[PDB]
Amino acid sequence: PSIKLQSSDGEIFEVDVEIAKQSVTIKTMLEDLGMPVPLPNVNAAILKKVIQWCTHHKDDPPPPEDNKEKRTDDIPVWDQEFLKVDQGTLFELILAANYLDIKGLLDVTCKTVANMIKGKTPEEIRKTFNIKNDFTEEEEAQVRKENQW
Amino acid sequence: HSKAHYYRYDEQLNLCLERLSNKYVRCSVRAEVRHLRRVLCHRLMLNPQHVQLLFDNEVLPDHMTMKQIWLSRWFGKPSPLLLQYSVK
Amino acid sequence: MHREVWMAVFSYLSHQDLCVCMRVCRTWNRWCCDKRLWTRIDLNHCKSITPLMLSGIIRRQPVSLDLSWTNISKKQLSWLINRLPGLRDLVLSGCSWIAVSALCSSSCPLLRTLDVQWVEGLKDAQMRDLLSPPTDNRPNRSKLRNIVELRLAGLDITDASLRLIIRHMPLLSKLHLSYCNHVTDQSINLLTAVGTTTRDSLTEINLSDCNKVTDQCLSFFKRCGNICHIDLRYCKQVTKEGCEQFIAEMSVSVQFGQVEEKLLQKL
Amino acid sequence: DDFMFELSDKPLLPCYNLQVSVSRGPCNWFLFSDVLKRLKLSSRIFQARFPHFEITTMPKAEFYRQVASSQLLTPAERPGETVELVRYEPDLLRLLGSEVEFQSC
């Protein structure tokens, strides 16, 4: 069986239902009726890679969640390669994962972003992310000097 | 009182340090192994990498306090607590 | 900047990284300081307690605070516990009674777990100030009402401290009395007696390395309807044979087994 | 708030952690008779020569009570009219022939 998904830019994709249910959102639409499913909140190329990721993880065992807590060293090799994209696509992947409710993809994309923060200084963060510093120098000095871990 | 909590006022215990194959030290029950290794180094002009504190030929952890060493290894025995140190 | 999306990234960051992120921009300083990201703060072996540090703790509003081996002062601890209404877990291991005495205040939050292992100067008399309730004209207002886990390892307390525990801690479940060598089997008899909240309240007890406890305390433990953890490791006067007799004389109603040595755990 | 260590090549006198007054926090003390025997000085000469040292007394039952709660002292090690005490401080330790070292935490 398959399911027709329509991007918000109109494009249509053919996906295995068991691959598509990875999105809890899509799964709960399918149950709701059935007698393309519009994804008004997802671009096409985004929806193209989300389908890719789900097809790779369609056979995963369920993830143990206790002992088990936030950690960033957990990213499978394949996901690290699939996630070598531009910063734009990366954030769009997060938003897509929230809209479609795919925690595996949401957790793995956040782990990537977090990895490009860890160990780096405020200035590098800003350079990495293009974040405009808004601190008055007294404010910026105050803050860092304001506290030490 | 604003300073009644300093280690200055803690209960004190007595140690004897013999070289693994003679010095006598008194310190707070909350002093840790690392602090006592700290003190040997100055007395011997050494670095922590080369001073180890032992009991029954086991190196003691740096964060264990004298009172835990005493109660786990010396309970019921008279002063002072006998420890060994080595130079490697 | 999508706020929820960032909070998703930030939850994977450590507290150090987050502290760095606060310096990134004027917004992240607010987001990264959200109390969701600071539920448990650990300051262990912290040399200096600056008034800037304290202020930052209040602003983060944690529910668990680990001040062990910092030798914080009674003044700084009073400041903290009066600004932190939602504090439930407080670890004061290796500190001083003079600091722990700040919990005698009436503004002390209703803690559920208190750790006072190895604090210098905490004896029977001090346990009495800490547990006895405040002034009142009538002829339980103790701030430790809601305590579930209480850790007393290494203290110079006697059975007298325990009567004061049974009286004021209805909810007590996990009790740690390790390296409390004045404790005797009579204490166990007192915790596990008919008509005491602790008899049925206790779940886990750590008597590890108490030299006056013997196999006789096992008899009292058979009275407990909810005991799951009995740690008698390193009690020189307790025998692995007496433990097997506890497993035996209890195995009708309850199935116990020693995971290792003298430690007993309901399977 | 640092650790102070007392060092010597010969065994050290015992000290006891006592609160001598409702108005003072607990601190450490020697038996005054022990400090005199090590120094080979009389009570008279000691107090005349070193007046800034603190000498105080407490009932024998109160001393034994405060000392019996320790898990470090054994029954035999527990001493026990009154008991005379001199306070534990670096100046008295150096006088007794020891060296002092201050280790930070």
> What backbone torsions phi and psi does residue D9 show, to the nearest 5 degrees?
-90, -10
Task: Dump the DSSP string for chain C.
Answer: --HHHHHHHHTTS-HHHHHHHHTT-TTHHHHTT-GGGGSEEE-TT-----HHHHHHHHHH--SEEE-TTS---HHHHHHHHHH-TT--EEE-TT-BHHHHGGGGSSS----SEEE-TT-BT-BHHHHHHHHS----------TTTT--EEE-TT-B--HHHHHHHHHH-TT--EEE-TT-TT--HHHHHHHT-TT-HHHHH--EEE-TT-TT--THHHHHHTT-SS--EEE-TT-TT--HHHHHHHHHHHTTT--EE-SSTTEEEE-
Residues in chain C: 267
Give the whole-angstrom CA distance, residue B10 versus residue B28: 6
Residue D73 — left, alpha, or beta (φ > 0 → left; ψ -120 to 50 → alpha)? beta
The H-or-E segment that residue A126 falls in is: helix A122-129
DSSP 8-state assignment for residue D40: T
Terminal-residue alpha carbon distance, chain D: 8
* Mutation target among C123, C157, C209, C210 for the D interface, most CBs of D within 10 A: C123
> What backbone torsions phi and psi does residue A60 show, to the nearest 5 degrees?
-65, 145
Give the whole-angstrom CA distance, residue C177 versus residue D59: 32
Burial class, D47, CB count within 10 angstroms (exposed 0-12 / middle 13-18 / buried 19+): middle
All residues of chain C having their beta carbon less than 8 Å from the beta carbon of residue D69 are 123-124, 156, 158, 182
Question: Judged by CB atoms within 8 Å, which residues 66-105 of D form the interface with C?
Answer: 69-71, 104-105
Q: What is the resolution of this structure in A?
A: 2.5
- Inter-residue long-range contacts of C25-29, CB under 8 Å, 24+ positions, other chains counted: C25/A126, C25/A131, C25/A132, C25/A133, C25/A134, C25/A135, C26/A134, C26/A135, C26/A139, C27/A134, C27/C1, C28/A131, C29/A143
Residue pair C135/C165 in contact by the 8 Å Cβ criterion = no
Give the whole-angstrom CA distance, residue B5 versus residue C141: 28
* Residues of the domain holding D6: 1-105
Task: Say yes or no: D28 contacts chain C, CB-CB below 8 A.
Answer: no
Of B38, B76, B80, the CB nearest to D103: B38
Do residue D74 and residue B76 have CB atoms under 8 angstroms apart? yes
β-bridge mates for residue B55, sequence order: B58
D interface toward B at CB cutoff 8 Å?
1-12, 14-15, 17, 25-28, 70-74, 76-77, 88, 101, 103, 105
Do residue C209 and residue B11 have CB atoms under 8 angstroms apart? no
Nearest CA in chain B to D27: B9
Of C98, C124, C156, the CB nearest to D71: C156
DSSP 8-state assignment for residue A85: S
Please report the domains of chain A, with CATH numbers, ordered by start residue: 1-149 (3.30.710.10)
What is the total count of domains within chain D? 1
Q: How was this structure determined?
A: X-ray
Sole residue written with tokens 């032992």: B54
Burial class, A73, CB count within 10 angstroms (exposed 0-12 / middle 13-18 / buried 19+): exposed
Give the whole-angstrom CA distance, residue B58 versus residue B72: 13
Q: Which tokens is D74 given?
A: 């054994």
A77: closest CA of chain C, how far (Å): 19
Do residue D105 and residue C123 have CB atoms under 8 angstroms apart? no
Task: Say yes or no: A71 contacts chain C, CB-CB below 8 A.
Answer: yes
Give the whole-angstrom CA distance, residue C262 versus residue D65: 34
Q: Which tokens is A35 given?
A: 């007698």
Residue pair D83/D60 in contact by the 8 Å Cβ criterion = yes
C246 contact partners, CB below 8 Å, separation of at least 6: C218, C221, C222, C230, C256, C264
All residues of chain C having their beta carbon less than 8 Å from the beta carbon of residue B31 are none
* Cis upstream peptide for B80 (omega within 30°): yes
D25: closest CA of chain C, how far (Å): 9
Task: Say yes or no: B77 contacts chain C, CB-CB below 8 A.
Answer: no
Task: Say yes or no: B29 contacts chain D, CB-CB below 8 A.
Answer: yes
Please report the domains of chain B, with CATH numbers, ordered by start residue: 1-88 (3.10.20.90)
Task: State the amino acid at position B35 in one-letter form.
Answer: H
Residue pair C114/C64 in contact by the 8 Å Cβ criterion = no
